[PDB]
Ligand binder design. Structure first.
Ligand SMILES: N[C@H](CCC[C@H](N)C(=O)O)C(=O)O
Ligand code: NA
Ligand SMILES: [Zn+2]
Ligand SMILES: [Zn+2]
Ligand SMILES: [Zn+2]
Length: 416
């Protein structure tokens, strides 16, 4: 259930005019620096020549459960692997992407404990820690387009260190010299990549950092490496922790569950009651769209969680029901003007609305009261019990339609 998303030039011919990077994160589901960085890269950057292929989260089931790895460490499955391992097919997908001739370089993002130091200082600062280092398996890979891993790493590190927020965050090189006897790294992603004659790098951001600072350093590493590869790019923001925080916490982010209307990711009430979901559909099979790339649904006890990375956006208390798709649109008066409103849209209301009755369709305006049918009522903001709003701001309300005993669809009204 991982996806690969291309970031490419608008002109297809420009793909071959610069190198190709494979950018990967989220091989651990509890390393949000990485998969929030891949998410922001996908949402807010443009690649002008060459190609950057992105797998924003490698281990999505684990991400959804805020878990390091539900089926064990996925970054130890690139060497020997039982064919019955639940992640065997995923590993083959990842290996396939890595080994494609249209890839030159691989950058794997991680969040890691403490701060790496080449010599022991204390429990947080020592060679066994992983935070804030840029990592190679060896100094060179003969036969790669760009064999000089060490030079690339050193220059990328120099780029990152020109932008430190605090001096303790200084990046260091970590060469694991994997082929020489590092049996753990021999099982990991970048070493597989090396053996396909790809330049391969990993970037670690410290888990001791706030998410926004982790993402900041991940983006510095991505940009540093893109610069070394001479892959030209643009972003639509300034790279600082404040901007990163704002883009993670972006109020324009939405989730579209099934055929329901888009709902905002942020500032939802923490629980949405009697929430219609298609019956007889396993949760991972319920379609969900977003303008972000790390959104999904996951069962928790009797609830369905809406997740944004490791962030819990709301708890759905589901109402499982057949989704009848026959109703495409509903005639509504909005602020005096009659119009046809598509099922699954959000309509802004300044003053009032009125739903026209339909023969075999019942409308329930959630938060408005008199098998309720609430078509034929002129409804204003003052008529709502505000606690039924989707949003903390008390401005967004659900209108649900039923062709009993089936669910005919939903429309949101937003009072503006
Ligand atoms: N802290 C990571 C480092 C892996 C670095 C590189 N070998 C990769 O595959 O990403 C781990 O223990 O798996
Ligand atoms: Na190409
Ligand atoms: Zn943007
Ligand atoms: Zn990791
Ligand atoms: Zn009409």
């Amino acid at each position: 259930s991982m996806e690969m998303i291309e970031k490419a030039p608008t002109d297809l011919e420009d793909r071959d005019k610069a190198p190709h990077l494979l950018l990967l994160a989220g091989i651990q589901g509890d390393e949000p620096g990485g998969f929030n960085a891949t998410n922001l890269f996908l949402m807010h950057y443009s690649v002008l020549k060459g190609l950057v292929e992105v797998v924003p989260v490698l281990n999505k089931p684990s991400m959804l459960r805020n878990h390091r790895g539900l089926y064990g460490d996925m970054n130890r499955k690139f060497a020997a692997l039982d064919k019955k391992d639940p992640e065997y097919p995923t590993i083959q997908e990842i290996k396939s992407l890595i080994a494609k001739p249209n890839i030159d370089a691989v950058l794997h993002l991680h969040d890691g404990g403490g701060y790496y130091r080449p010599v022991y200082v204390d429990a947080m600062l020592n060679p066994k820690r992983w935070g804030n280092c840029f990592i190679i398996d060896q100094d060179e890979v003969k036969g790669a387009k760009f064999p000089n891993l060490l030079a690339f790493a050193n220059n990328t590190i120099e780029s990152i260190n020109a932008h430190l927020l605090h001096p303790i965050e200084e990046y260091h090189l970590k060469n694991t010299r994997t082929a020489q006897g590092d049996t753990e790294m021999q099982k990991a992603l970048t070493f597989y990549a090396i053996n396909q004659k790809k330049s391969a790098f990993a970037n670690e951001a410290s888990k001791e950092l706030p998410l926004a600072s982790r993402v900041f350093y991940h983006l510095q590493a991505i940009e540093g490496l893109l610069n070394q590869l001479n892959i030209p790019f643009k972003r639509d923001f300034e790279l600082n922790p404040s901007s990163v925080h704002a883009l993670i916490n972006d109020k324009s982010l939405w989730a579209k569950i099934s055929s329901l209307p888009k709902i905002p990711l942020f500032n939802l009430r923490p629980r949405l009651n009697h929430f219609p979901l298609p019956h007889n559909t396993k949760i991972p099979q319920i379609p969900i769209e977003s303008n972000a790339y790390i959104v999904g649904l996951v069962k928790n006890k009797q609830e369905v969680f809406l997740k944004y990375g490791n962030k819990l956006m709301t708890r759905l208390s589901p109402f499982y029901i057949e989704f009848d798709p026959s109703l495409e649109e509903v005639k509504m008066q909005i602020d005096n003007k009659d119009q046809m409103v598509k099922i699954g849209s959000v309509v802004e209301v300044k003053e009032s609305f009125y739903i026209h009755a339909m023969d075999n369709i019942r409308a329930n305006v959630i938060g408005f009261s008199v098998k309720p049918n609430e078509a034929g009522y002129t409804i204003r903001f003052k008529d709502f019990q505000k606690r039924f709003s989707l949003d903390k701001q008390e401005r967004i309300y659900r209108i649900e339609f039923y062709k009993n005993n089936a669910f005919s669809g939903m429309i949101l009204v937003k009072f503006v």
